[PDB]
Coordinates of C-alpha atoms in Angstrom, one line a residue:
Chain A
X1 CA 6.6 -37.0 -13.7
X2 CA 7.0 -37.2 -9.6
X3 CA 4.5 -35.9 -7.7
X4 CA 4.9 -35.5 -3.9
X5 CA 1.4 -33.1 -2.3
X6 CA 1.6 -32.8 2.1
X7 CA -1.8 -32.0 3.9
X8 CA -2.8 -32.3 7.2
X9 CA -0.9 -28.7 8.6
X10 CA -2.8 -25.7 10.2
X11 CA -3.3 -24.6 13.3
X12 CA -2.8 -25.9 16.8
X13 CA -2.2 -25.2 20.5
X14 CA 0.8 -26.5 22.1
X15 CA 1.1 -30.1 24.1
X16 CA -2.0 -30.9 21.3
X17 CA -1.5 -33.1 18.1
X18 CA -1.6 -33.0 14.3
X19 CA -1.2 -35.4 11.7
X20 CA 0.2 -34.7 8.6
X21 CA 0.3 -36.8 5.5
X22 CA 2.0 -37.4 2.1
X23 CA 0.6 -38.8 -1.3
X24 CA 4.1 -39.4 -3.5
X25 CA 3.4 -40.8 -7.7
X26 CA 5.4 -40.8 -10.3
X27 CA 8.5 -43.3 -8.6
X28 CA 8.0 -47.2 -7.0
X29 CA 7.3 -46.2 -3.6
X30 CA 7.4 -49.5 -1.7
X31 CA 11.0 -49.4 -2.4
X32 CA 11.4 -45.5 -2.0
X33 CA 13.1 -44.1 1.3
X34 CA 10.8 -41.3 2.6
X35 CA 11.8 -38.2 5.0
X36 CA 9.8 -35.5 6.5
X37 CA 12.2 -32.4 6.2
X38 CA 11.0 -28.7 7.7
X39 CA 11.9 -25.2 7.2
X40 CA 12.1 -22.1 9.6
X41 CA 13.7 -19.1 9.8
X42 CA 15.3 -19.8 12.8
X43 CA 16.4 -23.1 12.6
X44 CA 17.2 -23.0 8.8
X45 CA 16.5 -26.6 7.5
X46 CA 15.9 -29.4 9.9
X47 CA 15.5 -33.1 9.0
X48 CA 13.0 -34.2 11.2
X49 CA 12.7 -37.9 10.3
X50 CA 13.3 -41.1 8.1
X51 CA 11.7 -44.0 6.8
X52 CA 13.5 -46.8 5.3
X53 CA 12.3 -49.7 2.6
X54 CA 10.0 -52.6 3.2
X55 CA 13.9 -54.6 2.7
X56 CA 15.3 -52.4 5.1
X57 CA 12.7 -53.1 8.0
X58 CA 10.8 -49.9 7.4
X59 CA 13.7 -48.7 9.6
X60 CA 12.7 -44.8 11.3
X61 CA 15.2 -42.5 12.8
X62 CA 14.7 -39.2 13.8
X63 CA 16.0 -35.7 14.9
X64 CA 16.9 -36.0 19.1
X65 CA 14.7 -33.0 19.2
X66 CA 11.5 -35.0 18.8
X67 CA 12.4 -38.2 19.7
X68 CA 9.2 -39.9 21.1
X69 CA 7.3 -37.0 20.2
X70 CA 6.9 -37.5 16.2
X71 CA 6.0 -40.7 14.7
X72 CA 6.7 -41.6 11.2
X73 CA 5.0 -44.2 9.4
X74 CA 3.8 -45.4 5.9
X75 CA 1.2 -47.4 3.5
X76 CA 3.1 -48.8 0.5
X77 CA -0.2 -50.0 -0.5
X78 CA -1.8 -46.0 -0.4
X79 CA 1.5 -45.0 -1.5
X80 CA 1.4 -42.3 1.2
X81 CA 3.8 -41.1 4.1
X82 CA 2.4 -40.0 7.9
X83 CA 3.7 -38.0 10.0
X84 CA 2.0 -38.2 13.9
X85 CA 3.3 -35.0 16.2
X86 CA 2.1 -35.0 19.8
X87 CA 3.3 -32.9 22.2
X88 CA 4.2 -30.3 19.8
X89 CA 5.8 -27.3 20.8
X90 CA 6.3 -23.4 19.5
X91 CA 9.9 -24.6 18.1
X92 CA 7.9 -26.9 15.8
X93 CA 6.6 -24.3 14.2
X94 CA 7.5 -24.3 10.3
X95 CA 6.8 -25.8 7.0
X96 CA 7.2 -29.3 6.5
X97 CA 8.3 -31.0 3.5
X98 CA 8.2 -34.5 2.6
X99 CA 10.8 -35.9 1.0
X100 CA 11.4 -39.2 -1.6
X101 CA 14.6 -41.2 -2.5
X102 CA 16.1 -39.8 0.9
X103 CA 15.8 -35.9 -0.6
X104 CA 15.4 -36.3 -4.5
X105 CA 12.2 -35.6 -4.5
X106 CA 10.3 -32.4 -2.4
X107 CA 6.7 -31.5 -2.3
X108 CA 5.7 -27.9 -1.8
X109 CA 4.9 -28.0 1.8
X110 CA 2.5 -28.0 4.5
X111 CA 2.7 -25.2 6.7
X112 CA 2.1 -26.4 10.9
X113 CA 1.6 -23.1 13.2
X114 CA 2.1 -24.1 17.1
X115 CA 0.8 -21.1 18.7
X116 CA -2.1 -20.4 21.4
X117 CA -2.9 -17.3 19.5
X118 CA -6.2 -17.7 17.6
X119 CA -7.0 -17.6 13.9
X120 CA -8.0 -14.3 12.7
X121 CA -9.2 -13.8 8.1
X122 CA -7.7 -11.5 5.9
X123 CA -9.6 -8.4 5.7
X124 CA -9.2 -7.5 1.5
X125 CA -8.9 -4.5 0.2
X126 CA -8.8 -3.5 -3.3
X127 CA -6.8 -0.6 -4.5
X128 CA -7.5 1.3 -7.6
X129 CA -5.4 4.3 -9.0
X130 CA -5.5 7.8 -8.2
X131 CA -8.6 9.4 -9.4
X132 CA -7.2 11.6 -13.1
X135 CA -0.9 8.7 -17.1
X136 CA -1.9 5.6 -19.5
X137 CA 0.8 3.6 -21.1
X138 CA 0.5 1.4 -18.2
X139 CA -1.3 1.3 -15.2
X140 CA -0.4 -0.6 -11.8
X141 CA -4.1 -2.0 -9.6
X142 CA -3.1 -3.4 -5.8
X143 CA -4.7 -5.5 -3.6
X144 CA -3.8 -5.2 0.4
X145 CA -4.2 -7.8 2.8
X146 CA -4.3 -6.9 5.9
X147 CA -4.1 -8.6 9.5
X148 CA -4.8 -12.5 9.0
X149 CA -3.2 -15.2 11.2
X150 CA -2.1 -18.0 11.0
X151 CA 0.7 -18.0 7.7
X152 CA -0.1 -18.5 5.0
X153 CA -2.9 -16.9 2.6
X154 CA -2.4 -17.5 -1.3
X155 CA -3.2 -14.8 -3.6
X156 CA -3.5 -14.6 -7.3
X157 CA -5.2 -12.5 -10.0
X158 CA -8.1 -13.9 -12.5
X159 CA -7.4 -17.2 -11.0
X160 CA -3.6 -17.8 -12.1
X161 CA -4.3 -15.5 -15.8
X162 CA -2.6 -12.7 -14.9
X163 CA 0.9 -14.2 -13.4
X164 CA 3.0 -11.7 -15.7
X165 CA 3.4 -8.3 -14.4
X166 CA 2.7 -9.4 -10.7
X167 CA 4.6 -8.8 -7.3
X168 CA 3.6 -10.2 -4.3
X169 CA 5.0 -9.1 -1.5
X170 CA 6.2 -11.6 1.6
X171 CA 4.1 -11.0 4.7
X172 CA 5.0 -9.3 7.2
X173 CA 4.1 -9.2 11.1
X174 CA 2.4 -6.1 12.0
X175 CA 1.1 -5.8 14.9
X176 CA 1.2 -9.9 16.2
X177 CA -0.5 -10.4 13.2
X178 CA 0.6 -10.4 9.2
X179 CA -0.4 -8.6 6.6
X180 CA 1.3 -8.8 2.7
X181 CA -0.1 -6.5 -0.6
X182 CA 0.1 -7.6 -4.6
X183 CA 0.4 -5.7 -7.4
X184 CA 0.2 -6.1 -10.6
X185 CA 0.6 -3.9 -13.9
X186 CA -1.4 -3.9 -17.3
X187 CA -2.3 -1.8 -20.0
X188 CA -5.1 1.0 -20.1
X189 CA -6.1 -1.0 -23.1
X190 CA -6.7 -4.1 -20.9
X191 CA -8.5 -1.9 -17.5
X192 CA -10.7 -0.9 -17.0
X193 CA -12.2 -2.6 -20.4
X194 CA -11.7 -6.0 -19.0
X195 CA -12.3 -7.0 -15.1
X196 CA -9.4 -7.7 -13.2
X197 CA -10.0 -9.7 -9.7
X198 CA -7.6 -10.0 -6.8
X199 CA -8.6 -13.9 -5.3
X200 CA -7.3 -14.2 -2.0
X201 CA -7.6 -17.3 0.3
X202 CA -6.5 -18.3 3.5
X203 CA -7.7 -22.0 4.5
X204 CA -7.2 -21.8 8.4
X205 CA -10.1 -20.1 8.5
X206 CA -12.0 -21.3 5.3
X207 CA -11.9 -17.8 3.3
X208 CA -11.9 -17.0 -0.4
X209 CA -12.8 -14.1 -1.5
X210 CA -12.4 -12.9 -4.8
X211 CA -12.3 -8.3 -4.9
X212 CA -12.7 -7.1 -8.6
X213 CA -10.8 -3.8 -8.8
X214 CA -13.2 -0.7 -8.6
X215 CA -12.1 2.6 -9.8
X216 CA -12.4 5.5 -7.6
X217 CA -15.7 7.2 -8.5
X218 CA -16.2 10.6 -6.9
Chain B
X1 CA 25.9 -34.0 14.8
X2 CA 28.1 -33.1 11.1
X3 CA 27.9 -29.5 11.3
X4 CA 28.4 -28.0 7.7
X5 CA 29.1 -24.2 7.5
X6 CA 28.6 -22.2 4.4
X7 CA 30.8 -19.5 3.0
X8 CA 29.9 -16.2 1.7
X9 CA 26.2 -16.0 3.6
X10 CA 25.4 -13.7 0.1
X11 CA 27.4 -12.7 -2.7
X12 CA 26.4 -10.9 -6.0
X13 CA 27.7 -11.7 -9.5
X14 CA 27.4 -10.5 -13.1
X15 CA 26.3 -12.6 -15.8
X16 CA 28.6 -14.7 -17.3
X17 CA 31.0 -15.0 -14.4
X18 CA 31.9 -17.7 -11.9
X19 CA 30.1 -18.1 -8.8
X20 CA 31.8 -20.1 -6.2
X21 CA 30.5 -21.1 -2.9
X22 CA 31.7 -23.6 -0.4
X23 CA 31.0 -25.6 2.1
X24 CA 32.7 -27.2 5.2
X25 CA 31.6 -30.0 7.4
X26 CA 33.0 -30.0 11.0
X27 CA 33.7 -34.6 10.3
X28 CA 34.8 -36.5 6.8
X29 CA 31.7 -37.3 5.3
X30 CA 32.8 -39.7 2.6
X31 CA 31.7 -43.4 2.5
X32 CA 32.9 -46.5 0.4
X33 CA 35.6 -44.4 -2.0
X34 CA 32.5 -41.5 -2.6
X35 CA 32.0 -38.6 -0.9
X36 CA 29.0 -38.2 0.6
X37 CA 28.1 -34.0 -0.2
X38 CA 25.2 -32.5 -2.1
X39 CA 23.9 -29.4 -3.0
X40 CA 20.3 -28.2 -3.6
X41 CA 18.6 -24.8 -5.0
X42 CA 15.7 -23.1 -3.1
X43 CA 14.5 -20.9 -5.4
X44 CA 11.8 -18.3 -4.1
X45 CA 8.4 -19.5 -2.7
X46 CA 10.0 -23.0 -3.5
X47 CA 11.1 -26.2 -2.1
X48 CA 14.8 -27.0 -2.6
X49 CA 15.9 -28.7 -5.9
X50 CA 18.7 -30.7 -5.8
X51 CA 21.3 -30.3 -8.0
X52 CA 24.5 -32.2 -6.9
X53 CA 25.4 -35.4 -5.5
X54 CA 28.2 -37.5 -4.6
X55 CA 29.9 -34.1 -4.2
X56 CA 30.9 -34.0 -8.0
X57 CA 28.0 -36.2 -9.8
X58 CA 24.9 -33.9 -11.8
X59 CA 21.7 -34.5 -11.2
X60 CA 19.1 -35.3 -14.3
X61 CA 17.9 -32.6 -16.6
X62 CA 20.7 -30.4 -14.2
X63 CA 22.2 -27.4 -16.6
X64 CA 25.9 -28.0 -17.2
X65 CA 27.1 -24.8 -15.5
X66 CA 26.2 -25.9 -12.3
X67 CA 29.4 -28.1 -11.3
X68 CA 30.6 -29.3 -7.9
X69 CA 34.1 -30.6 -6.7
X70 CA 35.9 -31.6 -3.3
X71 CA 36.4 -34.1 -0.8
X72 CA 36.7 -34.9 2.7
X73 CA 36.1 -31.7 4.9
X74 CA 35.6 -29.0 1.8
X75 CA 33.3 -28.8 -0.8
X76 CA 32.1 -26.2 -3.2
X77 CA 29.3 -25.2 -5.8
X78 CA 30.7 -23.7 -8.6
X79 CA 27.7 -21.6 -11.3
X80 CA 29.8 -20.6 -14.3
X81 CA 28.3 -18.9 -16.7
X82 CA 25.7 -17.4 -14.0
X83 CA 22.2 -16.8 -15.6
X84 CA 19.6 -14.6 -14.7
X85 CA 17.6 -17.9 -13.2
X86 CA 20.5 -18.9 -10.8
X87 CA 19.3 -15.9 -8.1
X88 CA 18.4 -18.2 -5.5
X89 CA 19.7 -19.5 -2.3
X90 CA 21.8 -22.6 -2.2
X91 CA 22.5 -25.0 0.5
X92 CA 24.7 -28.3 0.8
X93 CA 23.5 -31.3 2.5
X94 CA 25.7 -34.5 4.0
X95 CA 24.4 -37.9 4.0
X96 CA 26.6 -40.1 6.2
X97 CA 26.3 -39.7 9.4
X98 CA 22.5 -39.3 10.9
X99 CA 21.4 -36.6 11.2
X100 CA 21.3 -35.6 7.9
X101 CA 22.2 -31.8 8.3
X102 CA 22.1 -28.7 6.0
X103 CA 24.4 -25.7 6.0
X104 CA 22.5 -22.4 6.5
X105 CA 22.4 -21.1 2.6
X106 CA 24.1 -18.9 0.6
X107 CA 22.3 -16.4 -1.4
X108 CA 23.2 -15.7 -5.0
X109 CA 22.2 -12.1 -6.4
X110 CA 22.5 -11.6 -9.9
X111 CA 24.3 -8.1 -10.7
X112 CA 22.6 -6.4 -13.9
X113 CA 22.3 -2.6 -15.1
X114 CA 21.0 -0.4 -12.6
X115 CA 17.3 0.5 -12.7
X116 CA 15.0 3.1 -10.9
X117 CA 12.1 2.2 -9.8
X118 CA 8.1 2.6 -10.9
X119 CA 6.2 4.6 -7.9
X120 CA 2.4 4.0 -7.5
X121 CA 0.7 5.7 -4.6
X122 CA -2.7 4.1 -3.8
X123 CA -5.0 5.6 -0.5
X124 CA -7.5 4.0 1.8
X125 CA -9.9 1.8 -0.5
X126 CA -13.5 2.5 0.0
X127 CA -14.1 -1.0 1.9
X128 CA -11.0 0.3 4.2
X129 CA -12.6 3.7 5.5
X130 CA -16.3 2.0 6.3
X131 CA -14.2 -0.7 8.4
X132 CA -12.9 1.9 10.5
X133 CA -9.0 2.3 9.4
X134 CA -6.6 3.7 6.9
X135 CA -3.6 2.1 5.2
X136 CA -1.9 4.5 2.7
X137 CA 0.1 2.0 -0.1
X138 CA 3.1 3.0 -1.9
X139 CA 4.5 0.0 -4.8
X140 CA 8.3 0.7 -5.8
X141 CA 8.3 -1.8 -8.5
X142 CA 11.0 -3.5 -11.0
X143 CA 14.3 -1.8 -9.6
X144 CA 18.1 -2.3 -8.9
X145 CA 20.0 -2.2 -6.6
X146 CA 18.1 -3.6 -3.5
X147 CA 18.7 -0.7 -1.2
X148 CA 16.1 2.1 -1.7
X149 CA 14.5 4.5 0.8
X150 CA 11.4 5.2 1.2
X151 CA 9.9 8.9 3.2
X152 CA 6.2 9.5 3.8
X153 CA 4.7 13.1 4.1
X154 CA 1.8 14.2 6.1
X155 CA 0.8 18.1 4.5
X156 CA 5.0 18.2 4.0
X157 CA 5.4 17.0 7.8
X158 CA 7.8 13.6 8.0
X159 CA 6.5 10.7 9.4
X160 CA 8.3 7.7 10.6
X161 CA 5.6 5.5 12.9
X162 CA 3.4 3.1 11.2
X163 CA 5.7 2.4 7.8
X164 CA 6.3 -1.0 7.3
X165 CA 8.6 -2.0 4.1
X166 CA 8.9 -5.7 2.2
X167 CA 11.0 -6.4 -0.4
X168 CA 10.3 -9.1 -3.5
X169 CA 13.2 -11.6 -3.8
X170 CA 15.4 -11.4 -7.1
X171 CA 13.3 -11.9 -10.1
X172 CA 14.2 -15.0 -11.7
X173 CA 14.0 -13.4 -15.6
X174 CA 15.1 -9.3 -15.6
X175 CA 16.8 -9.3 -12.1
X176 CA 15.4 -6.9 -10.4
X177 CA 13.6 -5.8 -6.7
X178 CA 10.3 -4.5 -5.7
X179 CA 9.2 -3.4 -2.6
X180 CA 6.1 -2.3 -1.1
X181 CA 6.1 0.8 1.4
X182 CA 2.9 1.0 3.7
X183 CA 1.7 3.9 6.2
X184 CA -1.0 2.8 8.2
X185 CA -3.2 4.7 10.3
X186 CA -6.6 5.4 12.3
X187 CA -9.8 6.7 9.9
X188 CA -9.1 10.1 12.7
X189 CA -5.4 10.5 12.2
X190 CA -6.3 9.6 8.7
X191 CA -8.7 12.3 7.8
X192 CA -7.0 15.2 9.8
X193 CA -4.3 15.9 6.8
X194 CA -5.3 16.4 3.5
X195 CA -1.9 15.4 0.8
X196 CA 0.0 12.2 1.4
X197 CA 2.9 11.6 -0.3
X198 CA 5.6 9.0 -0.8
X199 CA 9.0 9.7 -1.6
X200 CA 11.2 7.3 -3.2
X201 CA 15.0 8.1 -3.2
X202 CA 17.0 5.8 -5.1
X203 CA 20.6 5.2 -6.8
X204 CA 19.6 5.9 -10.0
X205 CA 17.2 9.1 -9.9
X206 CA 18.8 12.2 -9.5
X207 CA 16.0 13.7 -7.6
X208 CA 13.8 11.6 -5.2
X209 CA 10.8 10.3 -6.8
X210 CA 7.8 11.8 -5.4
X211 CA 4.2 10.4 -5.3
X212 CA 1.2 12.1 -4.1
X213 CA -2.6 12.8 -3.8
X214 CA -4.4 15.1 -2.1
X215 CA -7.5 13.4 -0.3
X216 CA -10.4 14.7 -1.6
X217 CA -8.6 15.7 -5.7
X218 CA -10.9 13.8 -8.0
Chain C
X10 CA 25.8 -51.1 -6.8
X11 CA 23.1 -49.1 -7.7
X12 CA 20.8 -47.3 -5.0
X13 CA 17.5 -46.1 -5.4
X14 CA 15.1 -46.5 -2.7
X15 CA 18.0 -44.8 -0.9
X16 CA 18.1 -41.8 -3.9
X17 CA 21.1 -40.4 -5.1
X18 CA 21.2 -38.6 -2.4
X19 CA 20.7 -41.1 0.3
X20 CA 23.6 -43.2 2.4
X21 CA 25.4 -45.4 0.9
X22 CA 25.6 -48.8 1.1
X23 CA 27.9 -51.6 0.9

């Protein structure tokens, strides 16, 4: 099994720096060709830069639109991939994938947000149903203006996964907010405790909200 | 710079059939007697997958409906039979020339029955009314086709300011949307009216769907 | 011949 996990993105102002990193198992890296590939809505996806072989010179080549900007670099020993951006701009701005065997292999991502804007934690708020049917019942959990992208939210710490939609985040106000919801049995709740666990790691939060009912 | 431009942006096909969708680079991209075109997968909240290399050649564990053919300037990505886990978005990638460059994607919907949707209607929690707003939720759940409206009431009185709406991408097992619908207002505004409903019109349902409460029915 | 540290969907090489 290949396993390919990016840290190092977050928050940063622009002209500043950020250095993001790679840990790749599972393949011979020493003789893997790695890439840093990122995605935007704008821009769609961009290959930002290469990385050849210890055979092939450890040969890098990049996108003209960074070009002595980013630096990409590697530790066959530590099996890991770097990726140094300096002067980094708003158009950076994206997640960023690193890549093995040119683009075999993808990890999930590390999110960079180039913005003078400051970070701002999720406010969570629990929904329960209308005070007073039963076959089913549907519990909600909004949250609501947070900053930078992204927060991760699950229910009962990844249990409940079935009967869940999360909704993509949306800007409102400069600033995002996004809701889940998920749907059970009234066998299942209010019997057993059902706890929306949001976090956001910009600014350090996890909060976990068990859903209340609506007591008059 | 190989440019590579995808055709359709979207389209939307019923199980069993034959999803085709191409792609076409703006120079040759083949390379020692192989063609240098792949094709990968994005699959919601997902990195790309790739599924196709050397324009034609499967990739490992790869289902065998997924097939792709061409050469020179065209290419394409043929799905046949289309399953339920095929709604993604799909983009082809060329590997000769630096830079390596990726068409903009073409999203697959997966047609099934028509379905209406589940309407929950969910007020201000507790926590929200002591921090000093009000965001009124409405959850359209589990529902095809993708278009739906939405129309908040305010004591019967339309409202249109404050409603922001977000959509789920295709489910990957039953096909199907969900959106989330919410009003969002001061504690004051809040407070002023009394019943708050959310109206869900819809393909499928004959009569809108309507959800309310009244604020202080308990 | 065969690729690898290249991928199968790297360049190709001579």
């Amino acid at each position: 099994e290949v396993k390919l996990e990016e840290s190092g993105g977050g928050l940063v102002q622009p002209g500043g720096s950020m250095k993001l990193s790679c840990a790749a198992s599972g393949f011979t890296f020493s003789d893997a060709w790695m890439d840093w590939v990122r995605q935007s809505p704008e821009k769609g996806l961009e290959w930002v830069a290469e990385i050849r072989n210890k055979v092939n010179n450890h040969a890098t080549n990049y996108a003209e639109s960074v070009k002595g900007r980013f630096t990409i670099s590697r530790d066959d020993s530590r099996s890991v991939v770097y990726l140094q951006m300096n002067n980094l701009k708003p158009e950076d701005t994206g997640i960023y994938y690193c890549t093995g065997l040119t683009f075999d292999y993808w990890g999930q991502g590390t999110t960079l947000t180039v913005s003078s804007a400051k970070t701002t934690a999720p406010s969570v708020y629990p929904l329960a149903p209308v005070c007073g049917t039963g076959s089913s019942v549907t519990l909600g959990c909004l949250v609501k203006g947070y900053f930078p992208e992204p927060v991760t939210l699950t229910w009962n710490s990844g249990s409940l996964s079935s009967g869940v939609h999360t909704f993509p985040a949306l800007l409102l106000s400069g600033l995002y907010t996004l809701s889940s919801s998920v749907t059970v049995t009234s066998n299942t709740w209010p019997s057993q405790t059902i706890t929306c666990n949001v976090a956001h790691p910009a600014s350090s939060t996890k909060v976990d909200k068990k859903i209340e009912p609506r007591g008059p | 710079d190989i440019v590579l431009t995808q055709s359709p942006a979207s389209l939307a096909v019923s199980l069993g059939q034959r999803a085709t969708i191409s792609c076409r680079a703006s120079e040759s991209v083949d390379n020692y007697g192989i063609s240098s075109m792949n094709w990968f997968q994005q699959k919601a909240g997902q990195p790309p997958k790739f599924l196709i290399y050397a324009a034609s050649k499967q990739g490992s564990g790869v289902p065998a409906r997924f097939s792709g053919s061409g050469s020179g300037t065209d290419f394409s990505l043929i799905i046949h039979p289309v399953e339920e886990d095929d709604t993604a978005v799909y983009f082809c990638q060329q590997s000769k020339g630096v830079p390596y460059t990726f068409g903009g994607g073409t999203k697959l919907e997966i047609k099934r029955a028509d379905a209406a949707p589940t309407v929950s209607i969910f007020p201000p929690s507790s926590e929200q009314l002591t921090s000093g707003g009000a965001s009124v939720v409405c959850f359209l759940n589990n529902f095809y086709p993708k278009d739906i409206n939405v129309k908040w009431k305010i004591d019967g009185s339309e409202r249109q300011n404050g409603v922001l709406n977000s959509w789920t991408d295709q489910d990957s097992k039953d096909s199907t949307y969900s959106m989330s619908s919410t009003l969002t207002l001061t504690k004051d505004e809040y407070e002023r009216h009394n019943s708050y409903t959310c109206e869900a019109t819809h393909k499928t349902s004959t009569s809108p769907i309507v959800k309310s409460f009244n604020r202080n029915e308990c | 011949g065969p690729p690898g540290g290249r991928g199968l969907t790297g360049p190709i090489g001579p």
